Design a protein around this ligand. Sequence first.
Ligand code: POV
Ligand code: POV
Ligand code: POV
Ligand code: POV
Ligand code: POV
Ligand code: POV
Lengths: 216, 216, 216, 216, 216, 216, 216, 216
Amino acid sequence: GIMALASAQMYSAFDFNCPCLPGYNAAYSAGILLAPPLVLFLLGLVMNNNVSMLARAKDPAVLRYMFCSMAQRALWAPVVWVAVTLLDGKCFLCAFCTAVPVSALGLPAPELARLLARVPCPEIYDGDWLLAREVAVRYLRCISQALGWSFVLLTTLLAFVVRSVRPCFTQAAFLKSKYWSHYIDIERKLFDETCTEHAKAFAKVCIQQFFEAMNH
Amino acid sequence: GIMALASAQMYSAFDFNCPCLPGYNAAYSAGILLAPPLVLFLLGLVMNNNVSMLARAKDPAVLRYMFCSMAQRALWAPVVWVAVTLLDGKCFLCAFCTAVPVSALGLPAPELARLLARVPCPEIYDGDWLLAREVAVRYLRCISQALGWSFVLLTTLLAFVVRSVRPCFTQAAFLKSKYWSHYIDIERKLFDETCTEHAKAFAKVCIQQFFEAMNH
Amino acid sequence: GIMALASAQMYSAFDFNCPCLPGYNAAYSAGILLAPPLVLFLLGLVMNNNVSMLARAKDPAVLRYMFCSMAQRALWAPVVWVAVTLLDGKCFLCAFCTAVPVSALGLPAPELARLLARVPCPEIYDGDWLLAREVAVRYLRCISQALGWSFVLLTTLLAFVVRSVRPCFTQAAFLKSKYWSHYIDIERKLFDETCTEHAKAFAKVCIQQFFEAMNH
Amino acid sequence: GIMALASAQMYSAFDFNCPCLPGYNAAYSAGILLAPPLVLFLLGLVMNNNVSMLARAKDPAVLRYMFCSMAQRALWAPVVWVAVTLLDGKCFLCAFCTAVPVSALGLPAPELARLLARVPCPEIYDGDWLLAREVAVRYLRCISQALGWSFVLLTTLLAFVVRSVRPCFTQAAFLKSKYWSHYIDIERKLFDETCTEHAKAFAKVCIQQFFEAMNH
Amino acid sequence: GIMALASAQMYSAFDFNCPCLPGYNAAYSAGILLAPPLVLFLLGLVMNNNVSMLARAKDPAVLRYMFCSMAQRALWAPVVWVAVTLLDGKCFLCAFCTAVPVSALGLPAPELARLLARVPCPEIYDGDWLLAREVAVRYLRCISQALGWSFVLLTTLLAFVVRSVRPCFTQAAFLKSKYWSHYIDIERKLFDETCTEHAKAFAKVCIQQFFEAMNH
Amino acid sequence: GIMALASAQMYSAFDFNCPCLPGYNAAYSAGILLAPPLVLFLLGLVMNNNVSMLARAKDPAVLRYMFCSMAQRALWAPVVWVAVTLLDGKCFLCAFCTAVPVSALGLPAPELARLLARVPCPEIYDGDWLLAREVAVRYLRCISQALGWSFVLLTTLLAFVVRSVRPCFTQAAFLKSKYWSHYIDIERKLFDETCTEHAKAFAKVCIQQFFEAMNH
Amino acid sequence: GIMALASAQMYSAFDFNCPCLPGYNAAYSAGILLAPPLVLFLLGLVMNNNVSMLARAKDPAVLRYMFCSMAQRALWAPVVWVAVTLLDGKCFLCAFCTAVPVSALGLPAPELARLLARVPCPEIYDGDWLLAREVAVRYLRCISQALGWSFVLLTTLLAFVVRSVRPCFTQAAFLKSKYWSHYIDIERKLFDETCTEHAKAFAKVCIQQFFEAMNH
Amino acid sequence: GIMALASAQMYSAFDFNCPCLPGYNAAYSAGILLAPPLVLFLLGLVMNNNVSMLARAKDPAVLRYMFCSMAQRALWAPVVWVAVTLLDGKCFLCAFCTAVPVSALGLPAPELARLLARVPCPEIYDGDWLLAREVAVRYLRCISQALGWSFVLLTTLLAFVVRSVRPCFTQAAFLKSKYWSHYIDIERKLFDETCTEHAKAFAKVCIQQFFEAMNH
Ligand SMILES: CCCCCCCC/C=C\CCCCCCCC(=O)O[C@@H](COC(=O)CCCCCCCCCCCCCCC)COP(=O)([O-])OCC[N+](C)(C)C
Ligand SMILES: CCCCCCCC/C=C\CCCCCCCC(=O)O[C@@H](COC(=O)CCCCCCCCCCCCCCC)COP(=O)([O-])OCC[N+](C)(C)C
Ligand SMILES: CCCCCCCC/C=C\CCCCCCCC(=O)O[C@@H](COC(=O)CCCCCCCCCCCCCCC)COP(=O)([O-])OCC[N+](C)(C)C
Ligand SMILES: CCCCCCCC/C=C\CCCCCCCC(=O)O[C@@H](COC(=O)CCCCCCCCCCCCCCC)COP(=O)([O-])OCC[N+](C)(C)C
Ligand SMILES: CCCCCCCC/C=C\CCCCCCCC(=O)O[C@@H](COC(=O)CCCCCCCCCCCCCCC)COP(=O)([O-])OCC[N+](C)(C)C
Ligand SMILES: CCCCCCCC/C=C\CCCCCCCC(=O)O[C@@H](COC(=O)CCCCCCCCCCCCCCC)COP(=O)([O-])OCC[N+](C)(C)C
């Protein structure tokens, strides 16, 4: 929920500017596509109250179920982030602009990969001959949205299969897991109210021992 | 409700830009009309709490009714998305711009399909002779809205027929289905409160066994 | 209420653009005036909880009353939509622009019906001689608002007559109808609470039969 | 309340454009001043729950009082609409622009009534000689606001007189009217709860007769 | 409260345009200063629930007190309206612009009163010689704000005196008035609940007499 | 509270325009600094429920205390208004612009006091020689803010002294005052409920005497 | 809280304009940095309900503790105001602009201190030779933010030390202080309810003595 | 929470302007990156209610645990501030602009470090030869975002490790700590209600001793 809402609204606040240099284009875009997905995965494992308990008095089946159910909810931000990035076209445009068919709809090996690398940067682009900048753009942003929809499809067709076979699920392990998660909470609330009554008997003997001073 | 509201507000956030190339126009528009409808269908089956139970101790009539009633609610986003796409004209304009009567209200086979393909792109369009760009536009966007209203009509005239004959419906199967859906919930709430009382008797023996340490 | 509010706010979101062609003008405007009214009528019959029950153990008088009262509420969107369309003038301007007195306040049969057809389109209009475009506009939008007020009047003078004679109404049939509509609801709420008690006696025997496994 | 709020906010949404033609000016303005007041009167009679009951077992004095009190609340929109229309000046400007003193603060009978008729239309007005357009405007909009304030005065000085003499009022008829309006409501609420208990005894015999099927 | 809030927010919605003609200036401004104050006075008498009761079984002292206390609350809009009108300067500028010292800080009797009358109208003003238009303005709007503050002072110094002597007040008449205003309300609430019990005994005999029809 | 909030938000709604004339500058600014403070003082005395009771059965000490505590709360708007007026600089700029050192940072006695008087009016100022208009401004608005801060200081250093000595205060008179203010309220609430029970015994005899008419 | 929120939002409403004169620059900025801090200190002492009680029956230790705890909360606005003023740079720019190294990154003693003094005033600055105005600005606003951060650091490193040693604190004096602050409140609420019962016995004898008049 | 929200919204209110001078660039940026993180750390220790209690009757293990858990929550603002500063590029651009490869994608040692230092300042930059200013920018802002993501990764991969080994944690010390934190609160609430009852017995003897004065 909030994790998935902070994944799409964290994309618009982060500015994508790319170097438009013939070697840094691909390296910069590969890392601004893979790293923040990997950060939203670890930030979903860290922030549920079972990461330490799995880190023995519990059956191996109950651990395997309680682990695989832990990861599957961490995969909602890593998937919503990669989809909004491919449906935008900025990351795909910078990484692949240097390899575009200039003969169809359109100098050594250098002087051309250095000219084509400035396509995503409108104020730097000089070579408006050999290619209109809006013809190379608007063609790489369509190949990017064909992949952004093939990813949402194959990913939704896979979350459907893991609700019909339900691997790593047995009713014996699903029941034993739901019981132990209840024992955790009740033992907590019982401990607190036993701490606020064994202390309240020492409070009354401390106050009247300190009400000895300010009464004379 | 929310599924249908996320279907119309997901259309304005997604930008439709099309390639304006004489072969990619039709392929790009066919997929930006069919794929996200197919994604909103699977995303409605996956997110109701009966997809696994249907995946035997239950009568075949009760399964067939509980299945056909499951799909019919998944068809509200796929229909609202295809209707708003045809009532906008952008998808129809790009896919059919290459085949427009240039003699009425108006070079080899090439040099013409490549000139006509840039009609939806105002900054790329060169051939302002042989056709005004706002005369070819404003004529394809009217054929698109005649189909967008013929689709809302024939689709509303079909949701009316399936409320008067009510196929795959019998009162015997409608009653048996509503009963089993109640047994699911009551067995759930009875299980939990039996788990928070069989554990609460072991809590009191654990706390005083751990209140053995911090009292001496 | 909501149906009537979704009828006026659905008019501003839908863009009226017309072809300004000498044959498509009238056909396009006739269908963008008649079809969405017909869609809001069927969408009011479909969405009340009596369309199937009327589709025999009930008196014929009670059916006729319960039918005619069903349609009269479906007529609030079809009337509010046709009124806002005539009080705007866009639909009337495109359908009748080709037949306007050019002699009063102002070439074969063609070259004139093709010149006059571009009046509603300001960027396409060439023939600024023989007619100022704002003189032909501002004269068709006044004939359109005389009809838009004659329609709201004759329609409000008819909803007044069907509250003073009240056809298809008898106190015998109005009373029998209000009773059967109460029997529908009470039989529903009685069925549910009988389903959550006959099942709750089988739940207790299932849980302790499944509390046999995770206790040893 | 709401009727009076929908009367002033319905004036700003409706656009006043007038033909600026030497014969349609007066006819168009006479109807855009008289018709929507007449529509707000019938729309206040239709929408109170006594229009049918007055359409005999009741004294003639009680009917006359209950009728005259019915109309007086329907007169709050027809008066607020005519006042906001005269305090704006647009309707008065178009209907009387053709008859303005051009000698004071300033061609056959035609060529002058056709020149003066375009005063309310700034883009059509040609005859900027013989009259400045803002001198003929700003003089007809002051005669319009002297009448708009003489109407609010004489109308408020009349609602004051019909609260001090109180015609068609007698304490005998005011008391008999307030009693019959209470008998209407109590007989309604008594009928419903007698319909949900005579039916609830047939529900229990229908459910267990339909709980005969899904129990074996 | 609301009357005083509708008095200041009704001033900004009403547009002050004045004729800038040498005879209509003073007449137009005298009436747009005196009439709407007189309308807000009668609209405060009409809308309190004692205007008819004063229009005999009650002592003359109790009537005189209950009348003079009735007017004093009607004087809050007539005073807030005249103050905001003088603190704005538009009404004072148009009525007195024709009589301004043109020798200090600066043609027959006509040709001068007709030139000076267009000072409040910036687009009509021709005589920018003999006077700068912003020098005649900005001098009449300062004499207008010296009077607008002398009016708020002498009016607040008078509402202070009528809270220290308190004319037309005696404790005998203030007590008799507060008692009769309580007898009005209690006799109302006692009448209603006596009307909903004498009718409820006839309802039960009507329903079972009409439950005679729809039971056989 | 509200009085102090209506004192600062009443300053921005009132427009300060000054005459820029060599004699009206000082008189206009002296009155737009002193009068509205004097109006907010009398408007705080008038609007507390003790102004009449002080206008004898009460000790002289109790009156003197209840008077001096009455004024001190009326001094919060007169002080917040004079401070915001000096911290703005407009009033100080117009009243003293005619006497500014034109030799330092820079014609008879006239022709100079009439040239300097137009400094606060940017569109009227002619003498841009002998002085830049933004050099005479920006120097009078700094002397105005040195006085606006010396006033807030000496006024806050005086509200601190009258909370440490507390003149016109004795605990005998503070206690007698708080008691009489309680007797006022309790005698009020006791009077009302004695008026709604001595009248309720006459209501029952009036209703059944008027239920004599509409029952036969 | 509110005092600290009114300290930062009172800075943006007050306009900093400085004279840009070679002697008034430093004096104006020294007072617009020191005075409003001193006003927010006295305005925090005045507005807590202990300033008079400290102005004897109470131990000297309890007074010293209750005084030093009184000042420490008055220091939150004086510190937040001086920090936001140094982190803005306007006050530092005007006071030190006259002494800036014009040789590094760049006429008698006069003609130079009078040229440099107009740096903070962009419309007055003439000497754009010998110095770019944005080079002298942007260098004084960096020395101002190095001091604004050294002040927030040394001030936060001092509020940390006075929470670890806690001077003027003893548990005997902290306990005696918290008790006397409770006796103040309980003696207040006990006094009031004793004033509304000794008066309520005289009310009943006054009302029936005044119900003697309006009953005959 | 609020500390972390005041860390990111305090970054946009503080303006980063840098000197663009060849020696102040690095010193200014090193301090606007390190100091406010150090201020948000001390401002998190100071504002929790245990900083004094740790400044002996408590076991050493319980102190070490209660200290290390105190710091870890103070590290959420210092980490969110350093991350948003590196993901923006302004601090990295000014500190390293003087050392940029001008040969790749592009005078003594001086005249070059003084030319390159003005890159972050667009209005001061002169040397648009030898380097385009948007080519040196857009290359330093990409090296800055590779470090801003390597910091969020290595910092999130470290908060994951300290939730799986959990150093400085033992269940004996975690239990003893949670108990003492409960004894603190209960001894507080017990002290107050013992102070409002030992005082309430002296109040009744003071009031009637002061009700001796104002009763005679
Ligand atoms: C506010 C929202 C913003 C608006 C929307 C914005 C538009 C977004 C548009 C569309 C988004 C729609 C996508 C939905 C997909 C379902 C999510 C999912 O997968 O989890 C499912 C797992 O199922 C899987 O195992 C599939 C995961 C495949 C691995 C992908 C790795 C991701 C990193 C890519 C690396 C490759 C890099 C290479 C890239 C070329 C969970 O299964 P479940 O049945 O739900 O059970 C859990 C129940 N629960 C849910 C209750 C916990
Ligand atoms: C916030 C909203 C946004 C604002 C509005 C925006 C404007 C939108 C304007 C107008 C939209 C109005 C349309 C309403 C239609 C009814 C929906 C429906 O069909 O479901 C009905 C099924 O009935 C059917 O079976 C018909 C479906 C036909 C198959 C269509 C496939 C869709 C993919 C096309 C592929 C072809 C591609 C080729 C294209 C050329 C459900 O029947 P029911 O009786 O309701 O029973 C269920 C009860 N329930 C509802 C309680 C569950
Ligand atoms: C948020 C709102 C937006 C703001 C306002 C926007 C401005 C709108 C301005 C003005 C709108 C005001 C109009 C009000 C009219 C009343 C409605 C009505 O008719 O129903 C009445 C039926 O009465 C009839 O039978 C008359 C219908 C005539 C047939 C018209 C067909 C419509 C399609 C035209 C095809 C022709 C095409 C050719 C065109 C040239 C109902 O009667 P009732 O007594 O009420 O009883 C029901 C009780 N109930 C109401 C409780 C259920
Ligand atoms: C949100 C508001 C918008 C803001 C304001 C906008 C600015 C508006 C400014 C100002 C408006 C102020 C006007 C107020 C007048 C009172 C209303 C009234 O008349 O009803 C009174 C009737 O009294 C009458 O009988 C007088 C009616 C005269 C007939 C007029 C016909 C109207 C059509 C003209 C055709 C002529 C065409 C020719 C034109 C040249 C009711 O009397 P009552 O004592 O109240 O008793 C009822 C009690 N009740 C009220 C509880 C039910
Ligand atoms: C929403 C707000 C807007 C935002 C802020 C805007 C920025 C404003 C900035 C700053 C304003 C801060 C000023 C605060 C001063 C305290 C007020 C005061 O004085 O009352 C104190 C009286 O104390 C006195 O007696 C001093 C009054 C001196 C006389 C001044 C006359 C005023 C007219 C000038 C004529 C000279 C003309 C010549 C001019 C050259 C009250 O004392 P107390 O101890 O409080 O006891 C009462 C308790 N009580 C408060 C509960 C009732
Ligand atoms: C509204 C928000 C704004 C929107 C977002 C904006 C975008 C932000 C994007 C991304 C931010 C995501 C980062 C999250 C990291 C976790 C925080 C953390 O570290 O604390 C963890 C400690 O764990 C550690 O010990 C690691 C700290 C390393 C030391 C860093 C020093 C910081 C100063 C750098 C100096 C170097 C300078 C040199 C620089 C080159 C806490 O561990 P825990 O397991 O949680 O246990 C505590 C439980 N608790 C949490 C309940 C208390």
